[PDB]
Amino acid sequence: RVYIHPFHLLYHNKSTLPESTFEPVPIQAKTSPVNEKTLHDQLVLAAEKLEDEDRKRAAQVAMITNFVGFRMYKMLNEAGSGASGAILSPPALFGTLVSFYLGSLDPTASQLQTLLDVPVKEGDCTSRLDGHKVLAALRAVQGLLVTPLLQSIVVGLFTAPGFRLKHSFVQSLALFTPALFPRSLDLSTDPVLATEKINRFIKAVTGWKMNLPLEGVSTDSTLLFNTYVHFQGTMRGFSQLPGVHEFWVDNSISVSVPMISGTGNFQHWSDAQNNFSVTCVPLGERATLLLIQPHCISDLDRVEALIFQDLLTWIENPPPRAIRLTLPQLEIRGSYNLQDLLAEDKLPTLLGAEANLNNIGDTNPRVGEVLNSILLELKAGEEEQPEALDVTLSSPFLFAIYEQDSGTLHFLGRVNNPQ
């Protein structure tokens, strides 16, 4: 029975030419690849010129982001995320939802806000989220995160030939990420080839090897909204160990995988109440990798449901200590359709055919997939060539990436089998 009241993210006072449109260029059209460094430098500036007001908006956006992330993570696990584990980016999902919110009118608008856990007072427009404020706060926490440390979000907006996008909608989207690619293509004749073209396009414009889904697009789709997230962070002072080392996928089965290892002054503790432990490794001045180990493999589900389901009161802050950390080199790929997660959440028609998204384009779109896809890379900072506590991740565990100032969780996940 929880409710978030993000005052600083609402409209505050209750108060016209025809809207301009364009037609996106075909998906075939030659496009320069995304520059991740450029993106990174932009994001860092947005974070560097923050007022107190901005910090307040950022703390409120973190609350909305985290809550919907935990909720959708739960939905993902209910639906089944595959063998290797699970990964979800609350910022990316939240941004996707806020983008639809900006393109939506009631009843869809209010339903989206209700899903974000913010009360709506019918008749009262000053009770509504200001999506531009929201996306501006979300950009700022993206920047705070990355103060060689990369977080790139690119959006593929794929539309049927002849569907025209509203300028205002697309300009709103740029606040989510400037790496935005509206492209048209035939979605009505060969769904599987359309997905091939989309997957080929994204790989060419990003250079990321993401292992994207192959399933075809529904033939009546006029609009797809796909969000692609690349996170890269270097583990300073970590190097790959020689050889291969047993990783227990369960109590009777092991895989022998490459491990990285390093010693630093990290935070670590054991939660007595629920019998798990946590280790925190800094990834930058504001970014923290949390690594959560259950006491035994069969307790993983209980621990995961506990720590990932709203205020992270489980995050403690002990004095750092000398820890030798050993863990699998993490190269994590995941993808889901937000449509499926919404259906799992008993909201199958929220972005359905009757959704009012009349502020997206010149006609109401028919939304096909809304994909969120991730490539997360935790690289060893040193090439493979002192008393400390040994922490060794050689059975399934949970992880989160966390921004200290706002408290935004940028990723949450579970590793069952690192490959």
Residue 8's binding partner, choosing from Na ion, its own copies, none, with beta-carbon cut-off 5 to 8 A by kind? Answer: Na ion
Residue 204's binding partner, choosing from Na ion, its own copies, none, with beta-carbon cut-off 5 to 8 A by kind? Answer: none
What are the φ and ψ backbone dihedral angles of 411, each rounded to 5 degrees? -145, 145
Closest CB 100 distance from Na ion, rounded Å: 11
Q: Which residues are CB-contacts of 46 (< 8 A; sequence separation ≥ 6)?
A: 139, 140, 142, 143
| Number of residues engaging its own copies in binding (CB under 8 A) | 13
Are the beta carbons of 329 and 414 closer than 8 angstroms?
A: no
- SS3 label, residue 94: helix
Residue 25's binding partner, choosing from Na ion, its own copies, none, with beta-carbon cut-off 5 to 8 A by kind? Answer: its own copies
**Interface with its own copies by CB under 8 A: which range of 49-57, 162-170, 273-281, 288-296?**
162-170
Angle in degrees, 0-180, between the axes of helices 131-146 and 167-174, rounded to the nearest 10: 30
**Interface with its own copies by CB under 8 A: which range of 75-83, 125-133, 165-173, 378-386?**
165-173
162 binds its own copies (CB under 8 A): no
Closer residue to Na ion in complex, CB, 167/321: 167
Closest CB 161 distance from its own copies, rounded Å: 14
**Interface with its own copies by CB under 8 A: which range of 23-31, 219-227, 252-260, 269-277?**
23-31
In this structure, what token pair is assigned to residue 392? 């060794």
**Interface with its own copies by CB under 8 A: which range of 18-26, 33-41, 273-281, 381-389?**
18-26
18 binds its own copies (CB under 8 A): yes
Among 4, 21, 55, 299, binds its own copies (CB under 8 A): 21
Q: Which residue has the tokens 């908006």?
A: 57
CA distances from 270 to 117, 262, 275, 290, 390 (A): 32, 20, 7, 13, 14
Are the beta carbons of 51 and 150 closer than 8 angstroms?
A: no
Are the beta carbons of 238 and 262 closer than 8 angstroms?
A: yes
Among 17, 214, 253, 272, binds its own copies (CB under 8 A): 17
Per DSSP, 416 falls in state S
20 binds its own copies (CB under 8 A): yes
19 binds its own copies (CB under 8 A): yes
167 binds its own copies (CB under 8 A): yes
Closer residue to its own copies in complex, CB, 85/361: 361
R_g of the chain computed on alpha carbons: 22
What are the φ and ψ backbone dihedral angles of 302, each rounded to 5 degrees? -65, -45
121 binds its own copies (CB under 8 A): no
Q: Which residue has the tokens 């096909």?
A: 368
23 binds its own copies (CB under 8 A): yes
Among 145, 170, 224, 235, binds its own copies (CB under 8 A): 170
Residues that bind Na ion in the complex, under the rule CB under 5 A: 8, 19-20, 131, 167-168
d(CA 414, CA 147): 26
d(CA 306, CA 152): 30
Q: Which residues bind its own copies (CB under 8 A)?
A: 17-25, 166-167, 170, 182
